[PDB]
uL2 (Leishmania donovani), 252 residues
Amino acid sequence: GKTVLSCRKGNGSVYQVHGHKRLGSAKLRILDYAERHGYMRGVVKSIEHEAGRGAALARVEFRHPYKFRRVKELMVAPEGMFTGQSVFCGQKAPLAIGNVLPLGQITEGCIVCNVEAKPGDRGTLARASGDYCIIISHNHETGRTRLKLPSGQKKSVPSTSRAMIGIISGGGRIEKPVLKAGNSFYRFRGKRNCWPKVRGVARNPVEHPHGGGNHQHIGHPSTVSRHSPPGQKVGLIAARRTGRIRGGKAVK
RNA sequence: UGAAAUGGGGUGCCCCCACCCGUCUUGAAACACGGACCAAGGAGUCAAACAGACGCGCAAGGGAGGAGAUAUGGUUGCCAGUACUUCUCUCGUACUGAAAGGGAGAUGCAAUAUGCAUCUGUGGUGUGCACACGUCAUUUGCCCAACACCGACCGGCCCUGGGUUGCGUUGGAGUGUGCCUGUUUGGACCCGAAAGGUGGUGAACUAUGCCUGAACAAGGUGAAGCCCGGGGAAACCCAGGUGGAGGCCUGUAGCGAUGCUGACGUGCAAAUCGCUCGUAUGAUUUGGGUAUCGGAGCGAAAGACUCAUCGAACCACCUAGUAGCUGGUUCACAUCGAAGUUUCCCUCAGGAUAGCUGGUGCUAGUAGAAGUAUUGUGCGGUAAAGCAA
RNA sequence: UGCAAGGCCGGAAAGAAAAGAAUUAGAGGCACCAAGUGGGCCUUCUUCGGUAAGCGGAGCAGGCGAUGCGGAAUGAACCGC
RNA sequence: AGAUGUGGCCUGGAGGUUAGGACGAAGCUUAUGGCGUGAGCCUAAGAUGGACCGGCCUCUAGUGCAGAUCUUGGUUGGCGUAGCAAAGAUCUAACGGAGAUAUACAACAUGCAACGUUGGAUACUGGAGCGGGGAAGGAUUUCGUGCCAACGGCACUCGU
RNA sequence: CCCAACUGCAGACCGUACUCAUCACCGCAUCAGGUCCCCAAGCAUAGAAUGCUCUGGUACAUAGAGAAAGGUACACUCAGGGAAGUCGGCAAAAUAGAUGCGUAAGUUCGCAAGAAGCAUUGGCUCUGAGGGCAAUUGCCAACUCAGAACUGCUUACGGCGGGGAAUCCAACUGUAUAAUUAAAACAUAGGUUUGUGAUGCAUCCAAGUGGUGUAUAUCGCAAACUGAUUUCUGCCCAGUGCUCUGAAUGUCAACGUGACGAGAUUCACCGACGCGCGGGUAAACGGCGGGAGUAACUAUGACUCUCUUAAGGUAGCCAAAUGCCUCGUCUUCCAAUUAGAGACGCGCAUGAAUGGAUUAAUGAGAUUCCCUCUGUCCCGAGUUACUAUCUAGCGAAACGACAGUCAAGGGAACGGACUUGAAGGGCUAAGCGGGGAAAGAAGACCCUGUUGAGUUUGACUCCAGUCUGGCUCUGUGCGGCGACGUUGCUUCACUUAUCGAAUGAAGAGACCAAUGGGCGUGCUGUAAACUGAACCAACGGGUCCGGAGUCUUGUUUCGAGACAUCUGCCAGAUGGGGAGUUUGGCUGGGGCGGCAUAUCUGUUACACGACAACGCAGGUGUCCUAAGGCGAGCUCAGUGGGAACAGAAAUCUCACGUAGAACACAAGCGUAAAAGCUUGCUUGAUUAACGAUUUCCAGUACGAAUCGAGACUGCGAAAGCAAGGCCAGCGAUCCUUUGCGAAGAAUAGGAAAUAUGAACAAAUCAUACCAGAGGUGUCAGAAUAAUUACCACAGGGAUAACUGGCUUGUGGCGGCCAAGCGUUCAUAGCGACGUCGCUUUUUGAUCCUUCGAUGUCGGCUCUUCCUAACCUAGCGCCGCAGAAGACGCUAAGGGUUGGAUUGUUCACCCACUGACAGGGAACGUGAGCUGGGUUUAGACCGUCGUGAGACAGGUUGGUUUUACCCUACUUAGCUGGAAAUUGCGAGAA
RNA sequence: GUGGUAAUGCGCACUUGCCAGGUAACAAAUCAAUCCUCCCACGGUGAGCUUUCUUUUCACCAUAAUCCACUUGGGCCUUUUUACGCGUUGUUCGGAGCGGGGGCUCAAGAUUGAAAAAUGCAGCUCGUACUGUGUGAGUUCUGCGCAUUAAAGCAAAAACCUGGGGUGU
């Protein structure tokens, strides 16, 4: 029959990021010679809001290390980062909220956000509003640093990786009930075409494996194998557990 | 020499007779289906393989095909024909075995794991045109064709002289062509599907996202914050204003489309109209641009929608798709004239097969005659009877 | 020289008497090619299932189907033909 | 149902043969008869036609129609019938125009209805307009003169 | 050369009309549909509502005459009653603006709410209050509100809510089947679960250093389920899924390795994910029991026992949209209640995110009562515009074999035509909807077809995707385990292949020097932060070199690294995500059942043979080295007399014993010194040269059988008997597979040696010829699961669902006889056991007509007919005193009701009445209506199914088209005519 | 280049060598409200009505671009110090400088002139000359944004502009 809707999102026709009103990507400053052997000092020129992001971004204005010009970097602001602040980024940079240190220089148990999982990555992780890592221990022989992240899993990043001290801006967002279909409207408007979402048992059998009839019901177990082909994987994909978690929630 | 007369023709009438055609059908005048009129079109063809009738040539031989050669090395043409030709090719004269291989006459003598001689001859027997010599239709002779019973001989396989086996022989009958009928495949007598396949065109209708513009009369209710006063030991609690919140209410435009099961229902209209009704600051309505489409698109999900087409669009093609199914199938007269049963089939609306039927016949016109008697001789367990067997 | 068989050669042959003691619009026999049909239905008599049926299923035959014509006012099949 | 026969009827053509025709060929029409059981043939008449064509033997095929919800063209009864009923509606005078005031012992009883423009009357739209300007789409519909064949489902003298 | 104010010259290209719509565009057209933007007057009024009007623009939509019925309406009214109408208050009426007072239960405290309800309102003449400005005083604008006196109402434009008591469902706004469904369905907020740290999860993609979520980073992204709040979410991990291990040693492919052999071939071992084993998981798919006894009357069973499961439905809830029985039972509502509400619960078949229970507000959702109101109704009547009607102009289509009056008969069983009768003069205008089994559309229902299509899965057959193994990519060094110096594997340290990332490839490494080659580590600045500036060298040294270290066995840098998510091929597992196709037949329609599909005995079967049914009564797929073969001896079932225990029944004995026994089995037939029984010896149950024949039949095959000829035999003295057990017990082509063709000889292929691999020859291998086996049971022999209510096509009345026809079991109605009832007395009135009929208002049975179509329940309306008579008329009879009534006769002229509940027909109750009789007319009556029911597409529940989906269960919503033709009928005109038009053919109530 | 304590005023140069920032650039509701429309007031010209009434009813009364020289609202400076005071219809503000005096600047106007009456309109005269020329209801231009609910925070770039630095030196 017809192709499932989870497969049609894979074309990217209507379902792409909207992202027009967005300001561009948010990254840490480039890793330079100064970044590695010293620190570069900028100043926070503003704090604003991407459409479709829950955090709060920052235009931080460094001076160009080489030519005569002034470069503006856009990074995800920590919690108490205020306009006019001076942000230090580099190896010599002191340990303070918003400064960016190489993650091997930071104490033992510090709170860290916006980590880069690869030394030059300009940060990929702990970037979502309110989220932070916890760096655990530095391994001085192998040159690694172990840290938990937000999902509870504990990873090991090469300690030349950089990091930004302090939790991410937004906080909450989630703790507040939406209350109406209406507030969910511009919710995703800045994000994607995710919504509203018809559940599978309602739609006809061509379109979905759940597409049954007399009584809305799946008719066959909803847990699906890992090796199931696209258009078949639907519902709970290789579930180890199912139903209420009564005690436990081991990190997934 | 104008007429008379018989026949044919026309129109009306009387007595009488008389259901509407084609069709499927056990059964049609049917309340079974096609059917207003006419003109002009309109359906067993062409090709190939095989066969049997019938016409023709030739005959243990027949016949080419392709090409060549000249009259023609000519002629606008009549000539793309006719005339001519061979070694070959091919169907035959011989068949048999899985194959290696083998491979056919008669008579006499005669029995020799290849016997020997002769060569004017049906291998023998029964039945059998014509002919011949007789006889009162028929005796004998030879018997042609042909039917039947046998033997011999060739090939296979055999038992131990015998069994059998071939689409074998036993003084050849083929071959070429015409024509007809019947199989067969091809569009295949003509018209007819729901479908299937390759390749293109569509988001002007409509689904959804995005860029950038536009729009929402008049009222009702009266959230936060703010201002004044009152109460209280405190904490806080009461009252009057202001303020103008909401996928809030009434109500235009707008966007919709509930009820009349109203009008209309060969319309104003291939979905419209009238009053009534839903919502009308929001998940709102809307213009232009732009993005995602065919086993795919998009979907607040109804199999919705994708240009009057959607449980798989549109266009051209494969495609005159296949149909055991429905419909049609155009001149006359004459001689004849059925079947719905048997057996087998994924067979039961169909076929093949025997039967019924026609055509061509062959054969010495009473033969091997009979849906019937009589005589003789066999067979039998129904009707009746019996339960005192 | 009995019996089996294939013959040969002779014999006779109301060509089948008499007894009711046959009859025939009795040319026998063989062959090739091929069509249509393979839904039937009705009736005397026999007949099975059914309460029965203008029901269902057979037997021996005759009809309609395919065929009118005369008759039973009318009727596929009855009666006569 | 089916099989076959015919010195058996018709049709377009090819090989032959024998004829016809401007003194009238094919075609066409007829209460035109004659012949054949029949398909059909043949003659007569045309106050039809205007140039081709018949018989007979043989060959040949895109060769014979009443029926397919057959194809195409035409016609036809139904029938001067259904109907031409949303958006209120027109009236009068003078002038235009072929469209009249149209007559073999007065005028009505014997030329009906309808058209345009101007003036007057009455009425509708009722500023979310049968008001004035643009996009999409159309592309000469705009404008003046002439004009009424067809076209504006009635009518025009008016008109896109 | 720049700047400033002037001046001089030049200023190109394309569109430009008109239209933007009741005529300029799209809708076949000048079509009541659709189509973006701008400007927008006066008065009433809250006003862009609605009504009228000045500017602008129009009089174009075919008209005229005009009182028929019937209609349509953006038109009204109605005495008395007031929902009795009806499926149902459908439609209409009703309510109504503003101001003041007033306002319930319930509640998420927001509402409910305009709840409900009461009252005021005009006109006129006055009065008060509400301000600005200028220097207490002076001058002025624009409106609103309140109060009073007088006076009036015919309650009087437009516009503008009826309201209340409850149940079911969804929380709400929203979306949603363009053109039959607007809902309870979808969405939603809220809840939960699953995958996932980027070399990732989901996933597009034929393919790439390809693409999407991702401009992202667990408060994220992806995939499901549930559907606000409140209150809760119980038990089951056996099954099917998903998943996790290792202590998972079984099994599975290729490669890899080794061995016999001349070799192909062959064999052994090694060999992953998966499967198996072992766990986990239900807000994964789902599931959640029976029987008996027992308490001081009875009834119930807290309580015992018992069977049994993975667990035995917990909290709740209910004849509810889920309850068959069922119109459940009780209470309430009403005169009356198949409806509604509240209860009850052994619940056919309620139940917990397949969500349970509640739930204020909300609803073009479903239902029931109440007030108000009414032409819905009793019961209809009058008026209006536009029609129809007549006219002027214009002018179609549907349809059409031919046609058109009936009754009865038969017929294809429901005629316009035929048969026998009764009507019938012709032509016409408006109506009407009985008929033309009227018109539309090659029945959509049903069956059939060796036709499909959409979906589903545990079908058959495969394909992508995902995973897994091997080789490869693929390098270097010291080693460790193995194997027979080499090689398999492998730890670790490396870096150039390769992979991941970043950067404008922007500063690597070294100098600090070895296992190399021929102090510190590139270093002005900061140490919580709280917005300044920095460029195009100053300068030093001899135009160069510094300032600004030099060097390069060389990567742009970082991470990983010979690994895998790298590359390619080979190999397996998974795999409805996707493809192709299939999903027997017969059949008193199909389905379910059966087997009448291949078959054997008796019967039907009609004294040869043959003969049907889903006719009757039974069998077959096997069993037997003896139950086969043979010779010999014997006699069986049973009965009777007699014999220790010992009897009805043990064993012995005698007599009788026509088979009454037996023979593997169904049945039939046959058999007595046997064909039975006992016993002996045995393998005729082998081979049998291609013999013939029967049975079925086409005179084909198969199966089975009969008669033979040959070989070697068995038993018997012998004659003879035996090639299985008589007769049912079974199998094509192709393919696979086994047996026979031993050795030896032949001077040559013969009488006698099996042939082939085709240029020869050997040994393998393969094949051939002959006879057997592996099997098709649908048995003359395909390889095969579902659903369609989203459905399609070709046809069928060869075949179901209506009517009609035959039949009448069944239903209904009646007769005959007379056992008995009736205290008595068969028959006043009844009438058993029997028995004979009728009717066609029941249901069957059949399948004759109709499938290129006869509109398929009930009510309303309307007419007519029948009589088996309820009332009405007349009468007989009685267990008839009267009154009331029973039974019967003639008789169908007349009459036969108002309601509650139900879609109902049927049924029940209320009420009236002289009575509330039973029926027919295509189960009369849909171009007459209505559309509640059934019978579609949407949707919910229960039960069933893994699933799509089903249900003759429940529920809500779901288009009702055409008449102008012919006849009929109802009225309305014209007009001939007696030889019924002519003949002159002549008849006087 | 140059004045003012200052907000900033006045008209030798070049700067797209380079850099930095602005304009372009987007935003509810309430209140006030521009052009303009309507209505009223004043009264000039013609017309309508007239039996009666109506100092009456109707129409018109206009000034384009361009360029010159008091009011309202905001930002700000100096001065005197304020901790209760200023202010809106309105949810405010101040020692990080309220209020008062005096000033600077910006936005929207008003006013007087250039254009410009030579035009337009109406009336009238014998195809001409003359005559005439509001504290009201609407109104989105504007005040007005770091500006709306917001798990919604509301495009970008040419082109221009000023400055930094420099050139002139």
About this structure: The CA atoms of residues 46 and 113 of chain A lie 20 Å apart.
